[PDB]
């Protein structure tokens, strides 16, 4: 099932800062930071990365439970913000949920944290 995810997309974002790609990613976890701001742990099958942030305009996808842990989504627009210390925050601007959490049911594959 890992062939369903854009393996290598997290490394490409973190090395190249590519924003043209439309990677297919699995949500591993979502958590609100305190009008909620959602931080996402995402997987591309090979790696996870925890510095994804949901743009406020996408909050309805969480509020209506379309975007939830274990779902698979395709990113259609995102921005990278590189911190002074070199870590990168990935702001998800537009996305489509391709397969619901219920339909997927579990983490895909055995991704390891990016470093």
């Amino acid at each position: 099932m890992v062939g369903q995810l854009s393996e290598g997309a997290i490394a490409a974002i973190m090395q190249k800062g590519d924003t043209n790609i439309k990677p297919i990613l699995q949500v591993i976890n979502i958590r609100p930071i305190t009008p909620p701001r959602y931080r996402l742990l995402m997987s591309d099958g090979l790696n996870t990365l925890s510095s994804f942030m949901l743009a406020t305009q996408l909050n309805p996808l969480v509020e209506e439970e379309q975007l939830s842990s274990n779902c698979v989504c395709q990113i259609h627009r995102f921005i990278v913000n590189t911190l002074k210390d070199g870590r990168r925050v990935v702001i998800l601007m537009e996305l489509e949920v391709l397969k619901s959490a219920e339909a997927v049911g579990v983490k895909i594959g055995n991704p390891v944290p990016y470093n």
Binding site: N29, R31, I33, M53, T56, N81, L83, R87, V89
Partner: peptide, 15 residues
């Protein structure tokens, strides 16, 4: 609370 670091604070300060 995965990755409970200072990235939360950065994302708060954004926008």
């Amino acid at each position: 609370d995965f990755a409970n670091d200072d990235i939360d604070s950065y994302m708060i300060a954004m926008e």
